[PDB]
């Protein structure tokens, strides 16, 4: 009955993007740490689905290179996901693609490339890659955190995915887990849900949870990082590990994600549904271009103003739990903000509209 999978734009129509606006004038830089794109997957996604093919370029960093490897389960189906859901979104914008070595120093160098780029001057940057936030050395988080700090402070929005594995984050060890990026107080975190779109509008949206075997969206509370004096009105809840402590609420906002209700896309040259709250960043990556070249000038570091909003402008889920470690359901979705889906879905017009 429910739709199965979605292009972007019936996503994008869904959560109400606004319209006439294609991100001409903005580019989005997306961070990649393996695989590649090739131009054949990218110009049959976008003559498929009827949209400009946008301009797209690779960046080399720390002697990486735009690399297929031809496994759709791979690397590949990150990068063409993320340059196929966010350039449907925002054709008219340039796409910077920073391949980087999957190392920290890969990782935080890609980002630091993209934010200070003085040839490509990327307004966003858009991140799908990750891991749990204690399986990071507290050196290499710190100069990641010190590269989104500085991202704001240069007009640089940073978006990243939250994670495919529930609020265990794929740790085994007792303890509920966020994951690094999503974590840090300066990136918008982006979480996961199932979306289901009739007529153009939100039928129903629930938490992404497809169990242990089918991937759950990242969301829970910082360890590392202290609750932001802009999320105190949220009502975020203590970590559900033993001493209750006080952090960090991620996920932001949310959007789908669930591959039961995925995007179709071209992976490797051939059609496909696939889904992860990987979709998700480049998904409002792509919103934000097109509030960027609406505002004319760059949001930056949005975060802070999201959460003193009117309510009104969130889509909010209610209903689903992201627990795939066990049937305690944390954490759990409910009214405004939860650890689960953030603010819920952004309403791309009433978004616009406030921050006009
Ligand atoms: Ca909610």
Redesign the pocket.
Known sequence: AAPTAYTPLDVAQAYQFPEGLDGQGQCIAIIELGGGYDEASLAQYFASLGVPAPQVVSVSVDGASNQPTGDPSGPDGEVELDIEVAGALAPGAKFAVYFAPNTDAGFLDAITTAIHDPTLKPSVVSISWGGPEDSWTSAAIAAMNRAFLDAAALGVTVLAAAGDSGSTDGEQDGLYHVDFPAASPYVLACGGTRLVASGGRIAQETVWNDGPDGGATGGGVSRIFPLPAWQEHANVPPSANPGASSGRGVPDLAGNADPATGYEVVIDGEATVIGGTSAVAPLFAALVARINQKLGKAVGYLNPTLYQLPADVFH???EGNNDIANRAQIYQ??????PC?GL?SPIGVRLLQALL
Not at 333 to 338: I, K, L, R, S
């Open positions: 909010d889920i209610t979705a409910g009214p405004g903000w939860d889906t819920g």
